[PDB]
Amino acid sequence: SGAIYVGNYRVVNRHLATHNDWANLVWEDSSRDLLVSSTTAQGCDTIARCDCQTGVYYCSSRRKHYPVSFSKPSLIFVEASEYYPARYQSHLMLAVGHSEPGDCGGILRCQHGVVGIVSTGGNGLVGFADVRDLLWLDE
């Protein structure tokens, strides 16, 4: 669980979106595992606009933050689940680091701000759905 709040936006993993997020939909993309919904109050997260490859993510299964090097956003094959058939998930960045199914929603961030959220993982790897290209979150 976990979301990014930037202005009147709520960014969540599309597979964990609620009835409320779908009834207030702005944008959603199954290929990225992302869903953005409208909120009434103001959100104060800063989104990073950069090409950083180092940062810190929160791992809720360990109740700890961890520093990682992560790859550049790309199309990576993701094993079938109860939410999706087997497919390439776009805009994904991988890191060596601990991850568990309930860790989805944990924020990844660099000195510039929010980079993305935990979306995939397994075998000592952790995958993050990137949000730095979503320029419209700012405006």
Ligand SMILES: NC(=O)[C@H]1CCCN(C(=O)Cc2cc(F)ccc2Cl)C1
């Ligand atoms: N983005 C997706 O399609 C997700 C949907 C939920 C399932 N999923 C995972 O990777 C689950 C997972 C397994 C594991 F061994 C360690 C961490 C995680 Cl996040 C793919």
Ligand SMILES: [Zn+2]
């Ligand atoms: Zn950065």
